[PDB]
Structure formats: structure tokens, C-alpha cells
Symmetry: C5
Subunit: 307 residues, 5 copies
């Protein structure tokens, strides 16, 4: 088996798409193996560029096709090259921009914690013909500053395993294990924008909703509650335009439904305080002691729901 040493340079990770669960990684890949000795011009190593590589492969040079398992489509390969040494050492360096995929969980949306996975595997050669020796990952370009949307936490985590394919038992007996490289990069979201523009004014709106029981009349309370309901609907749409599409409810979504429930509970208490009459003229004040109890009860419900 040929021992291939891979090195992956990550230049930038961006373009996270929550609906399709993809992201875009840009960088280089450097594979290195040892073949037969050869005589190059002089003694210095020989360099083959982008179109010239196909000319050398047609003449019988062995260059394996390394596949990204979780890429969507095909990577946009830029420049690529081969460096052939007279010793017999071959180095294949290429640049990619792919759209990779993973199992991404956005259920805690502003306070999220994802990891970005690249999986690499030979397209055709099992580990009796090509096994990966070692893998170094250089993520020195991606940073941790407040400008960046995602905080990359620590260096990348690497792994080399042997994936077994059970459909090859009919045609390739005893040789169906393929050598796979996995690269994981942990990342934490920047929650500052979503905490200052979305979480806080919704809390202010919900807190200002509770001050309709200071109104003296009853029709004033209902008209004010319906104005607050329109405010909560407008805020729900204001958040739901500027946020990533998801098939489940995030934290912000949980708070919008809490706002709707607060408005409807306020309307129900106003009606029940109005309806407590002997025949239609007897006023009420005992139920309206919830100017300091209903906000606390709703806050306790929310604190239970957070835990």
C-alpha cells in the first residue's frame, strides 16, 4: 500500500446556510507520497502546472483522486500542481473552494455551538492500495476577534479511520475497507447582535405589556391590549425576516410565543376582572391585585422554561 501524507490549510470558513445545513470552506490540500525514482532535468525537482498535469497522467503517472465525502456537488478547484523529485517523492498541491455539509443543530440559535467537518477519502483505492499516513491541519488564518461572526475555539481535531463498505462484498472479496480522514473544527457563534437587537427590545415590549392594569376603565384596557397585540405581531415579523430559516423553533421564537401568551393572558384577566359582576354594574378590584403578581408568575414560568 502507498502511504499518502495529507496537509490541509484552511483559509476561511463562511457562508453557513442553515436550511440546507451547508457551509463553505476555502483552502489548500497537499498530498505527498513516494513512487519510483526518475531522472528530471538537472537534479532539481520538476514542476507541472494546471493543464500539464493531464499530459503527465496520460503518459502513465499515478496521481490518485482524493474525494471530499461530505462536499455538495464538486469543489471549485483553482490552481493545482505536481512537484516531482528525482528521489521518487511526489507532492500534489491543489486549491479548493467547496460547499460542505454536516448535521447541524441550531435549536439554541444565538448561543449556538457548531463544529465544521471535512471528510477526505480516496475515490477508488482501498487501504490495501492506498492508506493515509498522517494529517496536519493549519487553521492559522481564521481568528477569534469580535469582527468575525464565528469564534473558532482552539486548533482543529484530526482522525484517520477505516470505513467499511458492505456493498463491495459481491465483487471485491476481503478488500472493501477505505481509509478516511476526518477533520473537525469547533466554533461558537457571535451572540452580541442577536442579544442587543432581538432579545432586549422584546423583553422591553413584554415588560411594558404588563402596565395595562394601571388603566382605570375597561374599554381602555381592551383597546390597549389589542394595540400591544399588533406590536407583538409586528415585532414577530421584524425578527422573522432578519433570521435564518429553520424547521424548528429557536430561542427567539420561544420568546415570541411567550409574548403572544402574555398578551392573551392579559386579555383573559381583563375579561375575567370585568365579568365579576352581580348583574352588570358591580365593579372589581380583588382580581386586579395582579399588577405585581402576574408579571412575577410569568417570569417564573419563563425561568422554568429556560431550565
Amino acid at each position: 500500500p502507498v502511504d499518502v501524507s495529507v496537509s490541509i490549510f484552511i483559509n476561511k470558513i463562511y457562508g453557513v446556510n442553515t436550511l440546507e445545513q451547508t457551509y463553505k470552506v476555502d483552502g489548500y490540500i497537499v498530498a505527498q507520497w513516494t513512487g519510483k525514482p526518475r531522472k528530471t532535468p538537472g537534479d532539481k525537482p520538476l514542476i507541472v502546472e494546471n493543464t500539464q498535469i493531464e499530459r503527465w497522467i496520460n503518459n502513465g503517472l499515478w496521481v490518485p483522486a482524493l474525494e471530499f465525502i461530505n462536499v455538495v456537488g464538486s469543489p471549485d478547484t483553482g490552481n493545482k500542481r505536481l512537484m516531482l523529485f528525482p528521489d521518487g517523492r511526489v507532492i500534489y498541491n491543489a486549491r479548493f473552494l467547496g460547499s460542505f455539509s454536516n448535521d447541524m443543530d441550531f435549536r439554541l440559535f444565538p448561543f449556538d455551538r457548531q463544529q465544521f467537518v471535512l471528510e477526505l477519502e480516496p475515490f477508488s483505492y482501498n487501504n490495501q492500495q492506498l492508506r493515509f499516513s498522517d494529517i496536519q491541519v493549519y487553521t492559522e488564518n481564521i481568528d477569534n476577534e469580535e469582527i468575525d461572526e464565528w469564534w473558532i475555539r482552539g486548533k482543529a481535531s484530526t482522525h484517520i479511520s477505516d470505513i467499511r463498505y458492505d456493498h463491495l462484498s459481491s465483487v471485491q472479496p476481503n478488500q472493501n475497507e477505505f481509509s478516511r480522514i476526518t477533520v473537525r473544527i469547533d466554533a461558537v457563534r457571535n451572540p452580541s447582535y442577536y442579544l442587543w437587537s432581538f432579545i432586549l427590545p422584546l423583553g422591553l415590549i413584554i415588560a411594558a405589556s404588563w402596565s395595562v392594569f394601571w388603566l382605570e376603565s375597561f374599554s381602555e384596557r381592551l383597546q390597549t391590549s389589542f394595540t400591544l397585540m399588533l406590536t407583538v405581531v409586528a415585532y414577530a415579523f421584524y425578527t422573522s425576516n432578519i433570521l435564518p430559516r429553520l424547521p424548528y423553533t429557536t430561542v427567539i421564537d420561544q420568546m415570541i410565543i411567550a409574548g403572544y401568551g402574555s398578551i392573551f393572558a392579559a386579555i383573559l384577566l381583563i375579561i375575567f376582572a370585568h365579568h365579576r359582576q352581580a348583574n352588570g354594574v358591580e365593579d372589581d378590584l380583588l382580581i386586579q391585585r395582579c399588577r405585581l403578581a402576574f408579571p412575577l408568575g410569568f417570569l417564573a414560568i419563563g425561568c422554568v422554561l429556560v431550565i
Copy 2:
């Protein structure tokens, strides 16, 4: 006729587009047939990569072109390879990302139930020259968890038939049947997001609409009803931005029109209760017993409309 055995691996199904009725499938395809015996280097099977295949076809190798019937455009073929055995067995493995199409019914939108169809057919050879032996479909990567937008229900369903083309009777008599493979994958939508963010607050708004007959005056009722109408219009737009474009009304759309009808019926009852006067000063209370009857009548109408 040459017997070709196909195997389709489905990696992910995503990107469902309701207006154009498309979806995107990513995966592999493995065709396998038996030709003439040959002498390879050694006795081990020979492998041909991506660009090298065109070199072997020019020298006379028979590789059929398998077409996806319902693909839109042309698939984005990534890596592809041929494995040639000295026995005479040929295996063609290729990776695709296509945008397929089907007859999709979204008339029950959140509680939907679709099926994803892939149809495969030789581009040029009828079943007197190429017929499909058997087909295995491996959908082991696509899952059922709550993160996933679509719940894939059970294994895929396969079929091999003979499609007859009547336009070939002029030039190819008695040979116009083509062998076609059909693959169906049933899927159910994740209705949790649409049931918590769209169905429930609309029900709360419509339920809170009925509490305008507790208001004492008449001008208060009209101003409150118009505020509720603006709330329903804002909610209609809030849903209709965040939802898939369709040429027909879904469930959520049916509920928005029910909300408009509830507002207009409330306005009509307020006017008819106001207008019941002898000359302009006689008040009314008999018609305003619909504080507990009109909500029940509207709920009965909605329950009839669901069934």
C-alpha cells in the same frame, strides 16, 4: 441484450422548491455489466479515472450513457471511474448532484406528504440492446430525527418497467421499448415550526377578536374592529413572507381568509345591532347575546371546513 445492474446511493435530499416543483438529490450511481475478456496489467483489476475514461472510449470501449429522465438540466457530475476486470466485468461508478422534478402536491402544506422520484433510462439503447437486471437503493445516510426538515419513512421503493415510445415507429420498427428504472422515496414534513409559529398565534388573534362585544359603546366597537383588521392584515403578511410560494391556497391561507371573514362578520353584527333602532335612539341587547354563540358558530363552520 446486455444486462446492467444499477445501484443508487442517496446521500442527501434537500432544497425543495415548491414553485418549480423541484428538489436536489446528491449521491452515487454504480452500473455493472459484463463484456469481453481482456488482459490487464497483472491479474488485478484496472482503474480509470475522470479524464482517462474519454481516452478509453475513443479506443472503442463500450460505456453506455445512462440518463436521468426527470432531471432538470444536466447533473453536476463530480468524480467518475471505470473498474475493468480481466474476467470481462466492467463497473462504472460516478457521483452526481442533480435537480430533479416531480408532480408535487402542497395543498396540505404543514401536514404534507410527498415522495421523491428518480427515473433512470439509457439514452440511446432499447431493451433489445440494454436491459436493466436489478436495482438496489441505499438510503442509509438520510435520517428521521427532529433536526431534519423531512422525515424519510422507510426504505426506498424500486421498480423496473419498459417504456414504449410511439414516435420511433417510423424509423425503428419493432424496437422502440426502453428499459426504465424508477425509485420512489416517501417523506413527511416537519410540521412543528409551522404549528407553533403560524397556526397557534393566528388562533389566539381570532379568539381575541370575538371579545369586542364586551365593549359598552358603539364607536369603540368599530374602532376596535378596524384595529383588529389591521392586525389580521399584518399577520397575513407575516406568514406570507416566510412561506413557500404556491399557485393555490394552503391550510394557513385558509385560516387567514377565515380571520378576514371573522372580522367582517363581527363588523356586520356590530352594525346590525346598532341599526336596530326605532328612529335612532333605541338601544339593543337581544342581538348581542352572540358573545357566546357567534364564536361557537364560527368554530362549527371551521370544523365543517376541516372535514
Copy 3:
């Protein structure tokens, strides 16, 4: 001149873009002509695939380039093939996905009636070297059901004409007529969604606008009219987001302006009924008999504008 017989199969028509006046057609094209006799392997006809065709053209095979006149850009040609008969008959079958263009009129938007045109012409050969014999169009896949956005009315309409180009008189005297094939497919829009979600609640809002003259006071009337004006602006935006961009006003647009005019006329009548005072205290009731006349006058104006 060589007689070429074309057959066009339409698979689906979709993706209508109103601003750029384009649409997307997917399907096949089958051209068939007769050349010189040849000796094929055996007596059976020979098949040439996608890349192999370029090899046969370099050796001197005559394959004309058929151009779509109204395509925008270049079609995304998928698989293509040549079938060469020993008789001398040649059949060229290819698959396309193009973005075609036409002169489209959306001035009656929900109740629209368009036709989709494909124009085909040889790129280089005038009718003294290549004329189109006959053309069959098979639109059997596109349907009429309620799921489909567009109702295709009847079979396609075909035509073969001779287009004359006057700029070729300087370099090609007496030979400047080119043979052109035109294919027209009539289609009617699905108006159900736009009639239930856009036309009807706007009518309900405009009808509920007229019930502000039942209010007793004057400040109540002005505040209520301004609330209705905000409702009409919100509805105008709700429609104008979910509709195709156009450089002219459609029916729905005509109704939005009718709603604005109804609100402004209501405000003008409220002011003129208020202003009819001797010095500032004399009330009015004679002008306020338009609770049953102004709606009828506006409906008559709208009925005149429809006709």
C-alpha cells in the same frame, strides 16, 4: 437543398420571469436528414455519444448547427447523440434547457393569457442549402390540472416560414432567405390563489371602509379614517411583496388605487359634512345620507372602469 425534419418534445415549461419577459423550456430536439450512403459495422445503425460526435465532425461529417432564435444566452445541452444509418439517413437527438424570451403582456395579471414561443433556425445555411421539411411537436407531458400554475390549452401550433435578412445583400447576392420554424403554445394562468388571497380581502376592507358614517361624532370619523388608511397601506405592501415585478399597473394595482381613492373620498365627505356650519356649531345630517349612496356610486365607478 437538404431537407431536415424536426421534432420537438416539450417536457416542462416553468420559471416565468415577468420583469425580463423570459421563461424556461426543457425538452428534446430531433433533427433528421438524408446524406450519403455509408458502411457501418454490420448492417445495424451506428450510435455516437456526447464526446464522440466532435470526433466524427472533425473527419468530415456534416452536422448543421440549429439555433434557437429567441433563447437568452445558450441552452444547457445535456446528452446528445447521432444515429447513422447505412442507408444514408442521419438522426441527431439532443436535450436542451434554455431560457427563452417573448413579448409578454401581463396587464390583466390574475386573468392572464400568454403564449410561449420557440423559434428555430439554422445558424449558417440559407434555404438554398438547408430547408426544414416538417415539424411535429409533442407536448404530452404538460398538463391541465389544478396543481399546475399554467393551464396549457390544446396542442401546440407550428409554422415554417422564410425569414429574409437585408444585411446579407452586400456579400451574398440572391441568397439571404433562411428557413425558420415557429412553435406557439397557448397558456392560461391559475387565478384561484390571486382571487382568494388578494382580490377578496381587499374588497372586504374597502366595503368595511364605508361604515365610518355610522359613527356619531366627528373626531371619531377622522381617527377611524386614518386607521383605515394605514390598513390600506399595509395591504398594498402585503400584495406588492408577494407579486411579480412589472413596469405597469395590473388589476390588483388598480384596486389598491381604488382603495386609496375611497379612503380619500371618505375623508373629503367627512370634512365637507363637518364644515357645513353657519359659524362653527351648526350640525349636519343632509350630506350624511351617503351611507347608502356613496358605496353605490363607488361601485358604479368601478363597474365603469372594469368595462
Copy 4:
């Protein structure tokens, strides 16, 4: 120097992008020059198609590369051909779809007046080796009707000049002038949609804003003014979604700010009329004679700002 005669056929101009200042032109280009005499099959001129041209250039045929100077990227070249005459006359016809760029001024947005420029230049040959003889432009397909978004005013305007490049003085002395063709097409926007849907209801809203001084009380005036402010904000967003993104304020934008200023001036006059009290109880009517003066003053300010 070789004299090349160009003819440009414009098929359609569409897809104007205001932010990037681009537009899309589709059409043909026909260059024609005279070379060496040759012997073709027979005496009739010979035709070379799309892929065959590269075969003739490798054998030594001189085909210059004509570049569009202001194209963004590279044009989507469709079919192309060469017609070789035995006289020695060569005609190169090709079809393009490019995304061209210009210095576009949208500061008078609905009543705009732009011109579309195509600049053509040889990529490599200066005017001592290739100079453009004459240029005809055929814009017969683009029209003036009310369906069209842009009204093309008159025939195209053409020009042939000699552009001098000062960076070539180091390596190519006395030969750095290149022959450039410029084509200008004047166009006027269709202002009907923007005048009926955007200019007029904003004028109605601003005119209805002035009728808050007919209200008797003071709190009614403030609540009504704030409702009008919300109406103007909603209208500002309704226009600003459905309009082209620009880095400066257009006419419609000028009118939105005029509406905001009218609302704020109305609020200031209501406050100043309220505040004119001896101690807090003295009413006012002298300042409230601006029910017929403040609208006229604002209209005079707007008429000054238009001029």
C-alpha cells in the same frame, strides 16, 4: 493594417442593475476583413462551425480576438462561425450575451434618462496592424411600446476613435494607439407605474395629514399626528422595498422626507398652539389659522425644491 468592418445587431437590452451599474445586452457581432486568396471546395464559400474554428486557427488562420471593453466578466458566446471566401474575404459571425457597465445616473429616478454604451476594441493589435473601417448598428428589434420598461429613443449612435495607452511606451515605442468602436443607445424610463403607485398615494397621505387642525381638542391632535407618523413610516417601507437600491436619494426619497417634515411641523404647530397659555388654561385660535396657510407654505417649499 487590416481593415475590419463590424456590424452589431442588438436583440434586447434588459436586466438593468442600479447598484452595480450594469445592464445585459444580447445580440450578434459580424466582423469582416480581407486576407489571402484561397481554394475552397468548389467555388462556393466555405463555412466553419463552433468547434471547427479552433481547428482552423491551429493551422494558421488569422482570426483576431475582439474584446468588449466595458463587459463585466466574459460574454456567454453561443454559436459562432467563419465564412471563408475564395476571394480572400473572411466573415466572422458570433452571438453574445454580456453584462456591460457604464456610468449611470439614477438621481431623477422615475423620470430617468440613461444611455447604454458598448465599447469594442481588439485585444492585442494596435492600429498599425488592425483598424476598424466602419460600423453599422441594427437595433430594429427593441421597441417603444408601453409594454416595454425602457423607451429607446431613435437609432443608435456610433463612433470610431483611437485610444492611446501610456503604459506601452516602455516596450512598444511609437505604436500604442488602439482603434476603439463606441456605440451609444439613448433610453427613457417608463414612469407610469411609479407615478401611479408611488407618487400619487403619498401625495394623498400628505394632503390628508393637514386635516388634523380641524380637530377640536389637543390630545386628539397628538394621537392623530402619531397615527399619521406611523402611516408615513409604513409607506416609506412600502416604497423602499419595491425600489432599486441606490447610494443616494431619488425623487420618491425626497418626498418621503418631505412627508416626515410635514408630520413633524404639524406636531410642532400643535404644541406651539397648545403652549400659548397664560398659566395653563388659556385657549388659542390665532395660531390655528394655518388650516389654510401651512398647506400652502409647504406646497411653496416643495415647488421651490423642485425647481
Copy 5:
């Protein structure tokens, strides 16, 4: 080492994408080095076009591959050419359209100040085989007028350095320094649109918010404050649709939160002025002297926050 002289012509810089931190540069690149003398046809220099260059490289011509380090993907190379002199001087001219990337800071959004960076480096040759002699940058096409979105301040700034790669110490000892060219272009945003459409009406809305303490009653104050809160939410959404997506709060965002805080502080002062009662009937005027103090305090807070 071969001395290569680069010249970069910038045609336009556009398409700035704030989320992915990219921009698009269009222009030319002219590299020039000196090789071996050769015999061309005649004595005039020879020109090689777009497809012909690959033919000359296969025969052994040395053309280095110059890479853009910060490009995303691969540039859309249009026309390219080689000019070969009999002296031995080689000139490689090519046209690119790339999507470059940089570390962009939009934290002061309308009053921004960015710089656009292009980095150029040989793909394979270290500075013992290829070092960059000098670099001229011609930005004569990009301007400073008010039509342009970005004001380019002064000429471009150039630099030539030696980047050292530490991963090459294992296979290429003592030769791992690569010659890199950096080009920086400073640019200032056009703040006029954002200052007239976004900053000023928000200031008018916030200033008009302070005039709710002129209202006499208490329920009027609360209803008016909630109407103002809905106005601020609608304005927040109106700005946040028409602005670039960012992971942090800009100036406009800071002002929206200031508006929310002003509304909530106004509500708190109205409640605290209402609540100052002995048992529920004692009115208040001492706290309501903040009709001229609370606006000044909020303005002082904002002026502190600006500094």
C-alpha cells in the same frame, strides 16, 4: 532568479458583500520577464491568443502561474495573450474578474472607511527562481464623484515583500521564501443616503416621542406611548431590511436601541408620575417638570455615547 515586472490596471471595484467580507475587482494584469532569444516571423514581435497559449506551453515555453492569494474561488479570466519578442522579452497580459476578500470593519457603518487589498504571489516558484522586480498600479478609471458609492482617496499603495512558509522546511530546505506583491486602495463610503433617509427621520421620531408629557390625562399618555413603540418597531424593521447584514451593531442600530430606551424611559416616568399618590386620587405635577429636562438628559447620554 527571473525578474518579473507586474502592472495591475483596476477597472472597477464594486459588489461589496459585508457578511462574507468580499468585494469584486475587475481589471487587467501585465507581467513581463526576459528569457532566451528566439527567431520570430520577421523581426516584429509575435502574438499568441487565448487557446494558442496552451499550445506553446506544451512545446516548452515557460509561463509562470501567478496566483491571487486572497481571491475566493478562481478568477473569471477573459481574454489573455502572450507577446514574444525576438530579444527574449516576454509579456503576458490577461484580464480577470475575481471576488477578493479582506478583514473588513463595518462597525461605523455610514461613516465607514475601508481599504481594498489585492495580494499576488507565484503559485510554485520561490524567490530563488522568481522574484518580483517592480509594480505599477493604474486606478485611473475609478472616480470620486457623487454618483459613485465609494470615494477612492488618492492613488493605490504598493508593496513587495517575502513571505516565509514554515511547512516547507521538511522537503525544501533553505528555500521557502516566496515573493508577494500587495496592493492597497483606500476608500470612503458615500454617507448621504444613510444620513438623509435613516438618521434624520429617526431623530424626528425620537424628538416627537418626548411630547407625550404635554397630554393632560394618564390613559392618553400610555396609549400614545404604545403607539410610539409600534412606530419605533416599524422604523427598526424599515431600516433593518434596507441595510447590509452584519454580526454586530452599527450606528443606526445603536440609534434604534436608543429609541427603544427612550420609549421605555418615557413609559417608566409616566407610571412613576401616576403612582405618586397618597391612596389613588392625589395628582402630580412635580415629576412632570421633565418636559424640558428628560430630552436634555437623553441628549447628554447620547452625546456621551458618541464620544
